[PDB]
């Protein structure tokens, strides 16, 4: 079974739930948006959520200019860009 | 250990790491040394210039010549400088000899059954089937160049013997099946069943087998039609499809397995069934040819002992009397049969249509992977009716052994044939030295009842042509080690 | 390893555990629709 199963097991999670309470781990490479901006919390945190966006801005930004030729594909990817960049705007606005 | 673990943990593992030859990577190295050794020579024969292109090329010619040596194909190159061909012939002869010797060695290592790997059994099987077919093709070619071994005289003698018998019995050549046959439907049902029972118990059916079962089903739906097609093949078709050989292993013997194509299998089965029915119906085979129907083999042995005892006087030590049993394998039998003769001796017994058919059916291309050769000489024992042929020919040998008279004594009169062990008078028994004779497939068992006169005569002539001053006949003499 | 990997996975309908499931559910629904047809008559 692919490690997708093995990384999500209880014995993996529980130590993360201890590291949140005992220290400064818990990533932000895991969770998603969180959907709403104004519901985010103290600045030292949204700081990391923001880079957790800019990185994808860089990946797909590089993924723009590529000759690989799928124009419909780069169209939807282009819209995805605009969406994310708007999110970046939102995270800045909250800060 | 921990010394290595820790010093390796600080200092990293050794960068050299040479690795020795062992059981798994051996063959690879052997290849490697060989191709190198040919590189040297064929580079040193050439006058000056060219290397890498002619390198790769010449080594390719090596590989090809080896493959063609496995396949028995002679590997002539339309042009190539002769000395190179000398070299490559040399090295591939070498590799050949080492390869064969490994085949023998591994085989006689398996017969003892000590620690042979799961694969080496398979591989060794492969090498043995290759070598066996090579011996076969050798034998056939040398039979062409050297001509048949039967000679015209001996052949005439044989055919004469058989004719004399078949008149002595007043035998009718079997009729070819009528277009309308009263028992024909009954026989057909059995033959299709006997093919079906292979597939009743199978699980996974390959493509050829499924095609077969289609032919069987369509054969039930149109018995009259499939008769029409079958007999039509009996007449028209003298040329047949090739036949595959896959040697199956008994872990000591390796035995062949012939696999024919379904259409041919059907006519072969019907013709077989027919021949056995008509043959036993006309009482062709006498009593004493018995791998037969009515008796299972242990019952055969029991009746053979009771046969020994019940007949008179054998245990009498009264003066000089003695007795002998011969157990003789006929040796190669199916491999020495010849078709020019078969066609005739089947002409006697059977209509020339079926005889010619059978005769032709044995000459077919035989295919195992690469190896292929026409079968020009011996019998193919895998045909459904190879039974009948084989027994009939056996009879032809037995008439040589027993002579006409004594054979007519055993089989008795055509009016009332005897049973397995019987006679008319005890006189007819005592009138001849041979008392009991039976042939179970290859094996021949003979019984002789001798008295001082006849026995001392026999040893007089035998010793008369074989002087044995040192009394050493008993050195090379073999006997039972079980008791 | 020779034959089809599909036989060794659950989702494919062609193998005999799932074909039997479909047999059973379809058979039950045949019973139900049969009885409900007889009721309306």
């Amino acid at each position: 079974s692919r490690n997708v199963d093995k990384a999500n097991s209880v014995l993996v999670r529980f130590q993360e739930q201890q590291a949140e309470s005992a220290g400064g781990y818990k990533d932000y490479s895991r969770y998603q948006r969180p959907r709403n901006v104004s519901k985010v919390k103290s600045i030292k945190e949204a700081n990391e959520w923001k880079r957790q966006v800019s990185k994808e801005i860089k990946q797909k930004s590089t993924r723009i200019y590529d000759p690989s030729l799928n124009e419909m594909q780069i169209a939807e990817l282009n819209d995805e860009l605009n969406n994310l960049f708007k999110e970046w705007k939102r995270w800045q606005w909250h800060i | 250990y921990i010394g290595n673990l820790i010093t390796r943990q600080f200092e990293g593992r050794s960068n050299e790491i040479v690795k020795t030859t062992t059981k798994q990577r051996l063959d690879a190295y052997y290849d490697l040394e060989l191709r190198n050794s040919v590189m040297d020579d064929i580079l040193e024969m050439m006058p000056e210039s060219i290397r890498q292109k002619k390198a790769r090329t010449i080594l390719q010619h090596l590989s090809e010549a080896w493959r063609c040596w496995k396949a028995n194909i002679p590997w002539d190159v339309p042009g190539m400088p002769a000395p190179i061909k000398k070299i490559i012939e040399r090295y591939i002869k070498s590799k050949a000899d080492a390869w064969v010797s490994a085949a023998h060695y591994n085989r006689e290592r398996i017969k003892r059954g000590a620690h042979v790997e799961k694969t080496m059994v398979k591989k060794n099987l492969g090498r043995l089937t290759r070598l066996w077919i090579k011996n076969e093709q050798e034998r056939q070619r040398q039979i062409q160049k050297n001509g048949p071994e039967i000679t015209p005289e001996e052949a005439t003698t044989i055919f004469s013997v058989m004719v004399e018998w078949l008149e002595s019995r007043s035998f009718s050549p079997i009729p070819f099946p009528p277009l309308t046959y009263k028992n024909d439907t009954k026989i057909l049902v059995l033959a299709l069943e006997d093919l079906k029972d292979v597939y009743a118990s199978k699980v996974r059916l390959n493509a050829s087998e499924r095609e077969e079962l289609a032919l069987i089903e369509e054969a039930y739906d149109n018995p009259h039609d499939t008769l029409n097609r079958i007999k039509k093949y009996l007449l028209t078709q003298r040329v047949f499809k090739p036949v595959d050989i896959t040697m199956m292993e008994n872990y000591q013997n390796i035995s062949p397995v012939y696999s024919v194509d379904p259409l041919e299998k059907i006519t072969d089965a019907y013709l077989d069934q027919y021949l056995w029915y008509e043959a036993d119906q006309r009482k062709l085979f006498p009593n004493w040819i018995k791998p037969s129907d009515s008796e299972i083999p242990p019952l055969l042995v029991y009746k053979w002992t009771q046969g020994i005892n019940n007949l008179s006087e054998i245990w009498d030590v009264s003066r000089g009397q003695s007795a002998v049993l011969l157990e003789t394998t006929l040796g190669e039998m199916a491999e020495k049969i010849d078709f020019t003769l078969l066609n005739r001796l089947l002409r006697l017994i059977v209509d020339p249509n079926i005889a010619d058919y059978i005769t032709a059916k044995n000459n077919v291309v035989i295919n195992f992977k690469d190896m292929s050769h026409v079968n020009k000489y011996g019998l193919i024992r895998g045909l459904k009716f190879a039974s009948f042929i084989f027994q009939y020919y056996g009879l032809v040998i037995d008439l040589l052994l027993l002579g006409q008279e004594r054979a007519t004594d055993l089989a008795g009169p055509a009016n009332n044939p005897n049973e397995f062990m019987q006679f008319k008078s005890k006189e007819v028994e005592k009138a001849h030295p041979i008392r009991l004779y039976t042939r179970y497939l290859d094996r021949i068992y003979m019984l002789f009842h001798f008295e001082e006169d006849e026995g001392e005569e026999l040893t007089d002539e035998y010793l008369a042509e074989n002087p044995d001053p040192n009394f050493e006949n008993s050195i090379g003499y073999n006997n039972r080690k079980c008791w | 390893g020779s034959g089809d990997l599909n036989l060794l996975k659950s989702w494919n309908p062609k193998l005999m555990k799932n074909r039997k499931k479909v047999w059973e559910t379809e058979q039950d629904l045949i019973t139900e629709q049969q009885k409900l047809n007889t009721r309306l008559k």
């Binding site: - | 023998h104 070598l131 011996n135 000591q252 390796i254 008439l399 004594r406 | -």
Partner: protein, 69 residues
């Protein structure tokens, strides 16, 4: 992308590396001291060496004549 080899590795390379110092199993000292020199018959039908090759030899046809049955 399998290839024959068209070369070997020259030990000169391994000569310039530095030794690791791992201790093997077979290099533990052993054999540590040298050694110095100082009517029935009348009815019958019929009356009365080294080849060099592997396949055509006699032992071979004995072999395959047997193990094939």
């Amino acid at each position: 992308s399998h290839r024959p080899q068209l070369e070997a590795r020259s030990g000169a390379k391994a000569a310039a590396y530095t030794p690791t110092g791992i201790e093997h199993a077979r290099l533990l000292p052993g054999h540590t001291t040298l050694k110095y020199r100082k009517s029935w018959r009348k009815g019958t039908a019929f009356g009365r060496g080294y080849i060099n090759d592997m396949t055509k030899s006699e032992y071979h046809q004995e072999f395959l004549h047997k193990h094939v049955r």
